[PDB]
Amino acid sequence: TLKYSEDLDFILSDNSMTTPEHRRNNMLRLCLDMMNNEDLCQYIVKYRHREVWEWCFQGTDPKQKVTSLLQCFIADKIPLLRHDKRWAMLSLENFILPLATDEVFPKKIAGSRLVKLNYQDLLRKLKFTNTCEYALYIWATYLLYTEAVYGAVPALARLISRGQLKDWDTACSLLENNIVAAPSGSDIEEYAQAFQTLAGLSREKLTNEGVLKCLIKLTNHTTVLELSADLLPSLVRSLAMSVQLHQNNIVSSISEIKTNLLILQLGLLLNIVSEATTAASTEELTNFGAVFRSVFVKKPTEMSFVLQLFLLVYAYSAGAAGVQLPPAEADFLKSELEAFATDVSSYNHNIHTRITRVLETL
């Protein structure tokens, strides 16, 4: 209709002819209409999507928090198609990443009375009321795009360690997805930083699946382990005590949460202990001795992936600490490891390859 068309001519005022407050005020009034009127939204998307978008994103500045919030709502309310290049008007490195990693959000808006009422009213309706959370959301929802973002991996790790949010799944996923498979020396130093940050978190964070996947992914680059070597025995203790805490779930388990957790902690152990023989000999990891004894005595015909993984990580620990297993114990281990190798060979060359290496010492 007209009505929408004339409304939009009005609200989309030339940004080069207005003050930032007036711009901000028109954007507020636009968001609030769109929030209140699905029909206006359909209209924009069918007929004026490019002009509304170029108007909203003509200027972006992560220091203007209220405008940035409104702009995150627009991106979320009338997103462009995935491959539309006008997504580049929201710079990952200079707008989105800064907003994603800055928890400070103003609690007041400078403005008339009606401006402030309109703002409160919008805030009560928005999916998120600050740009840290909205910008993480936009980034992971619409822009998991994207070439790796420079400075993203350590800045996200720093954001997790400050601990302001109650859920890290999105931060962690974006951190994980911005680790490349063939990092430059510069990426590697960023990866080192981020790993030292995450490895410095409370022991509780070592039970968070998101954080563990980042830690596994970062530790895939062995040069990250060398640059951070003095932190490894400490991480290994934490992980080995956690595994020991839930050892009842290693042989058998009816818990998906506990099983995935043990698999991810053992996968992280494996990453560290197969590459750092000094860390493989950390004393608490050798208390995996107890559990292996349990398993060896009361053999089981059935071996789950978690138990196989435990035994592999154990074989690394035993070898580094100079544990000598009597011939029965060594042959059971060698033998269960060879069977695990036959399973994993078609689907995880990394594990197979670690098993092979270890079997050379058996």
């Binding site: 498979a181 596994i216 895939n220 991810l264 996968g267 992936f305 995880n348």
Partner: peptide
């Protein structure tokens, strides 16, 4: 299927 099998180790 969606079971954790550590394919993450290979990226």
């Amino acid at each position: 299927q969606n079971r954790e099998r550590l394919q993450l180790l290979e990226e």
